[PDB]
Assembly symmetry: D2
Homo-oligomer: 174 residues x 4
């Protein structure tokens, strides 16, 4: 009644957000699938919190699909200062905020390794979407959480977006 009622609203809200995501699978999508396709190293995906947990499942998906990739936590990379990433790698930074500090701090280091940077953000005017060689936008219009305490639609949009990159590359390799 009340509970089931509350659940379906969230579901409806996220299914509507996914229908809007259709437009964002555009040139940037293709463009990013190319940077990864020609990668002789590893696709390094990294993010914070919810994003981090998604970016994680994202890395496992790439790997089991023929795109070598691994997840790394921004905070952990800071110390070793991305000693796990080389010029041969391609980095995917995930953030809905687009203003995260951890990842933002790595920008200067990542930048001066001449490693391709792909950023998945919910705002094209963010400093990640900014500094990235290629920006993949996952902007959503409506959040399924009333107080916005936790990400819902944005989180799910990123997950699906990643699956579109995984399978896309898989097909590109015939």
């Amino acid at each position: 009644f009340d509970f089931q009622q509350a659940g379906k609203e969230v579901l409806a809200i996220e299914r509507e957000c996914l229908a809007e995501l259709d437009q964002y699978i555009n040139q940037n999508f293709t463009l990013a699938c190319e940077k990864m396709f020609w990668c002789k190293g590893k696709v390094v995906v990294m993010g914070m919190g919810a994003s981090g947990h998604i970016g994680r499942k994202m890395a496992a998906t790439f790997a089991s699909t023929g795109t070598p990739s691994f997840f790394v936590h921004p905070g952990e990379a800071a110390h070793g200062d991305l000693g796990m990433v080389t010029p041969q790698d391609v980095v995917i930074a995930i953030s809905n905020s687009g203003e995260s500090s951890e990842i933002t701090a790595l920008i200067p280091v990542l930048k001066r390794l001449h490693v391709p940077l792909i950023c998945i953000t919910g705002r094209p005017e963010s400093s990640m979407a900014r500094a990235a060689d290629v920006h993949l936008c996952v902007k959503v219009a409506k959040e399924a959480c009333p107080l916005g305490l936790a990400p819902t639609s944005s989180t799910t949009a990123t997950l699906v977006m990643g699956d579109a990159l995984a399978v896309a590359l898989l097909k590109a390799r015939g």
Copy 2:
């Protein structure tokens, strides 16, 4: 070709979600009630992909007013679930519903009197049977050519979890 393949996946999944609204049935309510009265911690656990999602799930619960944490089934094998107590609530995530790791903890999880909630894709799975409440997330179509990696299923578990989080949040205020 790329964008073509990318949208196909997006479509397939959006189609599977539309099928999910049915599973938000009485069980959903039932599960929300078991968790709503938990005085301990909502313990979420899973394997591989499920594990990754199950992690985001726990994080979402926490920031939502439902205290919870994630634990890997294998890790708790040695400790025999030393992190789980009677006043806790367990949410086992498993699409196969026949995961060995989790299956093993089942017995131990029962003689601890901990309300077990299972999120599976098979209503006739070992976990579905042994659980006090089973939350179904079955999907009819895979978005990956060789199912090398779960797609429609994993996203169905993610949104489902988001639906439990906010539901409970609204039940409070």
Copy 3:
């Protein structure tokens, strides 16, 4: 001969640090054992980078020893505003630095929540060292790494110091 030589020097450097640790198993150690012993909730362990991975194995050991406890990344709790930790929990913040921003950022919250705070650092004059209810020191004199690029002696001391809490608590029962 040149590699074995190097490997053996590290082993020796860390062993000499463990001998300096005996002193630190003092009144604070027992003081922390008690705070954990009467905990009715969970022993929430949290750390960053190297400390985190150890704090991770630390929680697993506690749990498998009879001390209910889990790991949680400091930055992750930043979002949930520490929604996974309640007043009847006990927090163990690991940091050799003792000035880590993330952990420092949570202090105010932990404080304003009435949660027993135990800190494991390598400097008795750090923020969390002094901001904790019980500081467990793991200071080391010599670093096994030439450029200090990665923590070596301090990291291994924290692992042992933790193993020293799990077994002690265990025996206490």
Copy 4:
């Protein structure tokens, strides 16, 4: 009593580390060499306690100049090791030396022509046998009364790791 039990655990472990020196032998040199010429990534993996340490190990390798990262054996199963290429070097951590998960990755790993290094406490183990270079970390005495949680073996692996990181670092400029 508490401090009494905390110091004994410390002694027992310090004793085991004193037994480790011997193992920092030829195999150590081999391991260091194959990792030194690695053009890809040093991929560390393990289960439970081993896993948490193998993690700090990867972090330590990286921050030291040895590009590396951790991956859970189970997770790698589904992707048939999609993370690893022929250009990589694998470090499998397992005290038991008979872990089912890691054993399964062996055939695949060999069929990739990737250099396999194993860190075990059992020279006669399956992964000790099937490895290109077995690095021994056997310990005579356990710090835990009921062996509910690894202690000496877990700590020996950690140090053995630190010894490869800095050893390789010094081998560089």
